């Protein structure tokens, strides 16, 4: 009785939200950006190849200096690379080799990683002993750790396969806020440029916008047909792009609270593993299961170019803060740095 | 054309590669085994004989084994099952005494049939096309006792064989091995274990050695 009545009210609320979004869908992003000229053909060459990982690379993250990056592989090794010289700065042996994510702190003093061990380990890079040591192991998640992002040296947000995201206090080792509401495994998260909000994508084909301080879900974004594997905020923080297993990328707007554009091709039938934006946001780079990385025109939904330099899945990619280069990691155990030429 | 500290930084990187090469050589000589099965199917007993992922290390006749137990994860299997692509073999545990039992959660699904669907998905999985399977059939002593009271007809309606233990045990083994839709790329090693058995580790060593040798014969191009 009460349960049946309540679930009918939920449908009414869903219809109210759908009508509200349809009311403000006066135009399409494609129509608005039809007049502007295309970006042309985007040609990028492999400037560097980072060798030394002996297994599938699952994650990478640039440092804020746009020169150092950390990559994670399931050979149980965290490696910090000098991208300019390809020198290895550090090699961190992991206690658990089943790592799935890695993050570089914006200060550069810490790195984080975690996987099937359900633990987010924090590593101190600046020690008087001259070696990298574990500073914290964040326990509390009941599923595998899929993504992690630092807010500062003391706060980090982690998403797990137990359908929840958490905000952690590194000094005390306790999760100050828990973000619940996803009905599937949360696979990725992206921080807003002001680090006051973050979006997360789960296997329920939905993306939720979370308030860090308040600790509740502000908005929910649907439209994908399969699990969301990747998510990335637009550089101005008013939009984000997702990547799913249905071979599509979608651009959602926070203020319009709906999808604006779909990035799919008939030839593409494989899942998407990673997505990122260029510095101006005009280019959307997505990694695919078909061993390639496709560069999309964000405004016009045109495939600007293809990065084909890997012999296995492109599992991760990232663009530097200055926008100078893009790094792609892959299951073939190599990292490559790409940029164009005049 | 490098500075004094640049030439020293390159030397540091060269030493890192030397340690990475040595760790890769050491890791390539270790046998990695993915342990699977259903809950309360003898899997825990196997580990003794030998909140995320539980890893067990043991050595048998100058061979180091790594056993990965992933039964404590309730998340989506397809989001992390590709992480084990490349293990030497899969150790699958099936409880023979659970042929007439009913799954506790579903309350209407046969327990033995729940193992077949788990075995069928793992054996035919795209990530384990070339990975052999070591099938352990536990609780053989308790299976014989339940045979006298509860016949095998409950589990398999189309079972016209005799009610003897040897006929019943062999029929179950054939059904599991018939779920292998790729009988050329991979091989299934079946062993009947028990609580008091002590040769289970030996069978793993024999099966792992058979897999390792047949991997070399493919690398050499003679097979």
């Amino acid at each position: 009785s009460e349960l049946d009545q309540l679930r009918q009210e939920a449908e009414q609320l869903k219809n109210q939200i759908r009508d509200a979004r349809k009311a403000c869908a006066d135009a399409t992003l494609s129509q608005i950006t039809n007049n502007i000229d295309p970006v042309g053909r985007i040609q990028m060459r492999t400037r560097r190849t980072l060798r030394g990982h002996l297994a599938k690379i699952y994650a990478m993250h640039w440092g804020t200096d746009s020169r150092l990056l950390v990559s994670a592989s399931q050979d149980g090794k965290l490696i910090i690379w000098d991208s300019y010289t390809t020198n290895k700065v550090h090699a961190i042996p992991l206690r658990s080799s089943w790592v799935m994510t890695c993050a570089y702190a914006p200060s550069g003093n810490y790195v984080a990683c975690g996987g099937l061990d359900n633990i987010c380990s924090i590593y101190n890079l600046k020690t008087r002993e001259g070696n990298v040591r574990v500073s914290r192991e964040l326990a509390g998640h009941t599923g595998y750790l899929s993504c992690c992002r630092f807010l500062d040296d003391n706060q980090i947000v982690t998403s797990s396969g137990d359908t929840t995201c958490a905000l952690w206090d590194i000094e005390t080792g306790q999760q100050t806020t828990t973000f619940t509401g996803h009905t599937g495994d949360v696979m990725s998260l992206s921080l807003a440029p002001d680090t006051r909000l973050f979006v997360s994508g789960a296997c329920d084909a939905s993306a939720k916008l979370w308030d860090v301080r308040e600790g509740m879900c502000r908005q929910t974004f649907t439209g994908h047909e399969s699990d969301i594997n990747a998510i990335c905020f637009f550089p101005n923080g008013n939009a984000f792009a997702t990547g799913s297993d249905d071979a599509t990328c979608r651009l959602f707007d926070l203020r319009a609270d709906q999808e604006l554009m779909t990035y799919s091709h008939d030839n593409i039938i494989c899942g998407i593993t990673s997505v990122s934006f260029s510095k101006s946001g005009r280019l959307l780079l997505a990694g695919y299961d078909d061993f390639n990385c496709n560069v999309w025109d964000a405004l016009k939904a045109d495939r600007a170019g293809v990065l084909a330099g890997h012999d296995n899945r492109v599992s991760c990619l990232g663009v530097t803060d200055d926008g100078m280069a893009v790094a792609t990691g892959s299951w073939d155990s190599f990292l490559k740095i790409w940029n164009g030429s005049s | 054309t490098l500075s004094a500290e640049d030439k020293a930084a390159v030397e540091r990187s060269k030493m890192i590669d030397r340690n990475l090469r040595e760790d890769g050589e050491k890791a390539a000589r270790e046998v990695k085994l993915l342990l699977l099965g259903a809950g309360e199917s003898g899997k825990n007993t196997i580990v003794k004989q030998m909140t995320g992922i539980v890893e067990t290390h043991f050595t048998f006749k100058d061979l180091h084994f790594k056993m990965f137990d992933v039964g404590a994860q309730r998340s989506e299997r397809k989001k992390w099952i590709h992480c084990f692509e490349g293990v030497t073999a899969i150790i699958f545990c099936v409880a023979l005494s659970d042929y007439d039992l009913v799954l506790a959660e579903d309350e209407e699904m046969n327990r033995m049939h729940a193992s077949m669907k788990l075995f069928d998905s793992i054996c035919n999985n795209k990530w384990f096309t070339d990975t052999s399977i070591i099938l352990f059939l536990n609780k053989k002593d308790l299976f014989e006792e339940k045979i006298k009271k509860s016949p095998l007809t409950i589990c398999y309606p189309e079972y016209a064989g005799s009610n003897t233990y040897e006929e019943a045990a062999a029929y179950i083994q054939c059904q599991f091995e018939d779920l292998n839709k790729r009988k050329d790329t991979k091989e299934i090693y079946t062993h009947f274990t028990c609580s008091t058995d002590t040769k289970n580790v030996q069978f793993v060593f024999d099966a792992v050695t058979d897999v390792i040798i047949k991997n070399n014969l493919k690398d050499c191009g003679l097979f």
Epitope: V89, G130 | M15
Partner: single-chain antibody, 231 residues
Amino acid sequence: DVQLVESGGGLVQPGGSRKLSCSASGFAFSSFGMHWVRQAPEKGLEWVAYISSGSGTIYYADTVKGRFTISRDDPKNTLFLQMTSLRSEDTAMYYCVRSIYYYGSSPFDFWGQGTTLTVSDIVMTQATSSVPVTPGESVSISCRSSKSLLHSNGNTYLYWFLQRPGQSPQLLIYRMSNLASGVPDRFSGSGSGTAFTLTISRLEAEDVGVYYCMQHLEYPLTFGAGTKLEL
């Protein structure tokens, strides 16, 4: 804590041999390159030898090459300096210095207490030998090099050290601008090309001492004469 204890020094006859030891504790010794730096009585610092991490690279000063042998024992965390044909010119306090080299590292960050031995090229110039100072007042120290220390990679390999009376040298500024860990922010290093300045705002009693500028652009590493601050 990080410690570097030297031993083996003492009074030796000319032409003799002596073995210096440097025991390291509290840090990953095998990850750090090691230097020997000596200081003659009432004189400045002089670089002696260098052995890299992993013992793959070894350098010697011209004044000691062929007579001194530097070696390390990584399992025992001990650094050695085998000396032969000792001359009266070798009478100095020998310091054990650790230095690690990677992107963003701070070489020469920790110095040992030193051991005393008594026997019976880019030019770095510090023209101002002494500077009378008062607490709370800003002081500038100048250093010059015969060659440009700015490399094509953007780094300027200039280092600043402070040797308080009775104490071992301490790193203040590495690569001409970066401030060493544990050093107050009042110290600042500024330079360009061949001319460099160390500015000390709001001088305090602890800042009193001798300041040395060292170049790390290429071997042999050379030190300036040193500028002494006195009240």
